[PDB]
Design a protein around this ligand. Sequence first.
Ligand SMILES: CCCCCCCCCCCCCCCCCC(=O)OC[C@H](COP(=O)(O)OCCN)OC(=O)CCCCCCCCCCCCCCCCC
Ligand SMILES: CCCCCCCCCCCCO[C@@H]1O[C@H](CO)[C@@H](O[C@H]2O[C@H](CO)[C@@H](O)[C@H](O)[C@H]2O)[C@H](O)[C@H]1O
Lengths: 57, 459
Amino acid sequence: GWVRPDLGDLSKVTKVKTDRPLPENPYHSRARPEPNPEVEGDLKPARHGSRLFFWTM
Amino acid sequence: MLKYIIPTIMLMPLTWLSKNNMIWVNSTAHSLLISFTSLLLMNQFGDNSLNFSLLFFSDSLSTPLLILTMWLLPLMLMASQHHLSKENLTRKKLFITMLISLQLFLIMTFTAMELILFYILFEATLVPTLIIITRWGNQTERLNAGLYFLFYTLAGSLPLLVALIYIQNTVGSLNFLMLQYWVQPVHNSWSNVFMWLACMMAFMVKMPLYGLHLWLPKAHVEAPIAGSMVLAAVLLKLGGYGMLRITLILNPMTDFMAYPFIMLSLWGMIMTSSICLRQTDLKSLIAYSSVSHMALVIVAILIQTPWSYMGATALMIAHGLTSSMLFCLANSNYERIHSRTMILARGLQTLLPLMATWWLLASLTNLALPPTINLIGELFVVMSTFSWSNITIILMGVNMVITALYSLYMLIMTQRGKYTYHINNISPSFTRENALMSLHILPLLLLTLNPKIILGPLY
Ligand SMILES: CCCCCCCCCCCCCCCCCC(=O)OC[C@H](COP(=O)(O)OCCN)OC(=O)CCCCCCCCCCCCCCCCC
Ligand SMILES: CCCCCCCCCCCCO[C@@H]1O[C@H](CO)[C@@H](O[C@H]2O[C@H](CO)[C@@H](O)[C@H](O)[C@H]2O)[C@H](O)[C@H]1O
């Protein structure tokens, strides 16, 4: 009772049920370094302007 | 300071929009009006300086220098308009523009509260000064004189720029008021030895210090009269004014770093006074006279005493008017005989009796006849250097003797004796020439009645 698969059958992506648990860290990754502390707040005008030498603005 | 900066700028539209025949009348009149209003800067207080804004302030040191600067502009216009008569009209207006722009840089230089704003304006005065010398000088050597003036100054200034920026980095500010309170002592080290040199060499070259003075006789002999007037009266005092301010942050290292420069000044003043006895060129004699006088100012600033600072402040003002007068007097002779050779035209008191009075008065102030402010300044310095070391009175005494010898030698050679026979174009002194001389000597003699306003912050 063996039926030959059709053209395109064997290239199908299929789903398979397994009782094996999905690996947790397949790449064996170390812990990622923490991100740089985010800078947040309300953008206020620069205090006393540029403050370049004598400039007052 | 905007009540002085803005009207000074408005002199440029006035000159360019004036009728072709009124450029001198208009610029002279309105520059005199600006000079009048500069007296309002004498609202000085016993404890606090006059601080107008974050950019400009005026204490008792800068106030007299500002008034000298603004008084000099009308005098320079009067002194130039004769030899510029044949000049092209646009090139006459460009000449006046160079003088106005110099006044602008100067009054901002003397009132800048921040030292890096002072540096830029202090340097900016070079361009108009150099252009005046090299464009409107008369001789071939004016080109070499421009280069010596430019590169002597820059050799010293560029180290000063590095030192000031380094000082701002470490102290956090260059505001002169802030420096008074945040100043820390300077401790010995080769690193501080060169910080001290960088902070003081730019000003030493401007004074000039003996040894570093060679640019000055070159520049004077080649500059036009107006250039020589501002050079001697004000631009030399940028060195003195800068030193009087920066020495605040150089203590106590100034105790021993001063020695090589006091030695140069104390000995240099005798050397340059003696050079005057053998000068053949009248302008060169007056140039070398300035070196001798400014040597006293350098010594006074470096010994750092209340009496020496008062003396230096008076000497700078007194020298400014006297040396400017002497250059103007020699110029009036030159406009007649067209040579600076001192011995060429003799016995002029016979031909120009009233101009011989000006020659006498100018000489008497130059030798510091009491109670002129020339004597007040020179005497206060001598009192303080005597306490610094008693033996200095020997060198001070000799300089006073030699100063009298060359001052009266210049008077006797040009004004007395027999007139030169073949010189027959000595026309009577013009009103412009006599008014120019009197506008030098009268304010100089008037200041004797009230000398406290030129004695500086330590009065
Ligand atoms: C340039 C004029 C000086 C000429 C001589 C040259 C001096 C040396 C130049 C090197 C740079 C030094 C300049 C020093 C001043 C700069 C620092 C400063 O001025 O502070 C910032 C300034 C705002 O100035 P502020 O104190 O706030 O006063 C406001 C008054 N309404 O904001 C600024 O920075 C801009 C101010 C620059 C100064 C010139 C502009 C002033 C506005 C007048 C412009 C002309 C308007 C009239 C147009 C006429 C058209 C024919
Ligand atoms: C017109 C030019 C004028 C030139 C004037 C010349 C002035 C000469 C000043 C010399 C004194 C310099 O200042 C001196 O420098 C050295 C820096 O190494 C400091 O001393 C430091 O280095 C020396 C090495 O020689 C160490 O032994 C010492 O332990 C260390 O603290 C001194 O504590 C300081 O007294």
